[PDB]
Design a protein around this ligand. Structure first.
Ligand SMILES: Cc1cc2nc3c(=O)[nH]c(=O)nc-3n(C[C@H](O)[C@H](O)[C@H](O)COP(=O)(O)OP(=O)(O)OC[C@H]3O[C@@H](n4cnc5c(N)ncnc54)[C@H](O)[C@@H]3O)c2cc1C
Length: 295
């Protein structure tokens, strides 16, 4: 059923870049690009929540070919144009400090991708992953906790749930549950897919709630910069109440350090009802209702 590894590193699918557009608006921090690839000529198929590998050209400092880097798929199974002909990615250009051999360091694969030109051929592998799949039940509740590019799998879920063209193409999935996205980024211009996310909330006020944690524009009750963990603590009781439903699924995607604060928040909420979150969570994971993908 679930498509997986239709293409592997030894014989990748050679796709062509259709478009490469900026997602970080003026005044934002960093570079994050939405890149769409043409899948025609191959049989790569995928579903929401999966990832694909990209093999960048060139060799590493040791002279060996570069290995693949995984990227969460940003598009639904049908592609952004709902034509079953493309696949998209949401790629941040990795760049960091000086104390790392030299002065400025740019990630190999992410810099290759963010600067790639339309028409270029790219080596693609996958799809991969069964840990971040969306339930087929249209009545399920879906909690999405995302940091930065962690928004990516969430975009695939939300588009499938709320885009007009998606609903028309998926007669078997007419979402009527409740979805809540808590999205943490440093600035408003850094709110990836902002316009479309807010459009969805305006059209489906009873099925989608959007909450932002904007660090450079908001402060938590302690006076520190606002991060996703702070919003989760602020809404811990509401989130725990939703999590208690047998049909609720939670997805966490973003930096590894985000998990600790989220668990501490939910632990305090669950404790009010005599429940130890760490134990309840273990059962949720075993039931496949607690999905995590951090990097
Ligand atoms: C399942 C999964 C999904 C992912 N999804 C996405 C996605 O949707 N979008 C996206 O942009 N990325 C995603 N990533 C990360 C992505 O795979 C690559 O790791 C990322 O693009 C960086 O690779 P690079 O080629 O830029 O860097 P490399 O060239 O491999 O450089 C990385 C290396 O440099 C060092 N390094 C990195 N950051 C720092 C720092 N701050 N300080 C010091 N040293 C550092 C480490 O040694 C690290 O191994 C995902 C990762 C996984 C595992």
């Amino acid at each position: 059923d679930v498509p997986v590894n239709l293409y592997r590193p030894n014989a990748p699918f050679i796709g062509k870049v259709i478009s490469n557009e900026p997602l970080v608006k003026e005044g934002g921090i960093g570079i994050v690009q939405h890149i769409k690839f043409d899948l025609t000529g191959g049989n790569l198929k995928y579903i929401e929540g999966q990832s694909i590998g990209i093999i960048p050209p060139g060799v590493d400092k040791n002279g060996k070919p570069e290995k693949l880097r995984l990227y969460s798929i940003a598009s639904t199974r049908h592609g952004d144009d709902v034509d079953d002909k493309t696949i998209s990615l949401c790629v941040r250009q990795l760049e960091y400090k000086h104390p790392e051999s030299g002065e400025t360091v740019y990630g190999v694969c992410s810099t290759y991708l963010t600067h790639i030109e339309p028409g270029s051929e790219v080596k693609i592998t996958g799809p991969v992953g069964k840990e971040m799949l969306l339930p087929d039940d249209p009545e399920a509740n879906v909690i999405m906790l995302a940091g930065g590019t962690g928004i990516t799998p969430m975009r695939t879920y939300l588009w499938r749930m709320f885009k007009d063209a998606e609903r028309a193409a998926n007669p078997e999935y007419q979402f009527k549950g409740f979805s809540w996205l808590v999205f943490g980024v440093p600035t408003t211009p850094n709110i990836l897919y902002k316009e479309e996310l807010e459009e969805i909330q305006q059209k489906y006020p009873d099925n989608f709630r959007l909450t932002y944690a904007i660090s450079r524009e908001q402060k938590n009750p302690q006076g520190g910069r606002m991060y996703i963990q702070d919003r989760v603590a602020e809404h811990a009781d509401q989130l725990w109440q939703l999590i208690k439903n047998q049909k609720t699924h939670t997805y966490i995607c973003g930096p590894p350090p985000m998990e600790e604060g989220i668990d501490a928040a939910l632990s305090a909420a669950a404790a009010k009802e005599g429940v130890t979150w760490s134990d309840y969570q273990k059962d949720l994971k075993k039931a496949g209702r607690w999905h995590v993908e951090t990097y």
